[PDB]
C-alpha cells in the first residue's frame, strides 16, 4: 500500500465518488442514454436508464 502516498489513496477514493456522482447526473440529464427497452415490442414509451 506504500507506492502511493496515503493522501493519494484518499484522492483516488474521492475520485471514485466524484466520477460516479457526476456520471450519475450526466447519464440522467442526457436524453441519449434514455434508451428504449423491449426492442421487439412497440411503443407507449417506457424508456428507462440503467445508470
Amino acid at each position: 500500500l506504500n507506492p502511493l502516498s496515503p493522501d493519494i489513496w484518499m484522492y483516488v477514493l474521492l475520485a471514485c465518488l466524484g466520477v460516479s456522482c457526476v456520471l450519475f447526473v450526466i447519464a440522467r440529464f442526457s436524453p441519449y442514454e434514455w434508451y428504449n427497452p423491449h426492442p421487439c415490442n412497440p411503443d407507449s414509451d417506457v424508456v428507462e436508464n440503467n445508470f
Binding site: 440522467r28 440529464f29 436524453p31 414509451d45 417506457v46 424508456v47 428507462e48 436508464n49
Partner: peptide, 16 residues
C-alpha cells in the same frame, strides 16, 4: 419544450 424534459429527467425510480 426543454422544461418538459427538465421534469422528465427527475423521476428517480425510473421506467418513465
Amino acid at each position: 419544450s426543454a422544461m418538459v424534459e427538465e421534469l422528465r429527467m427527475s423521476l428517480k425510480c425510473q421506467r418513465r
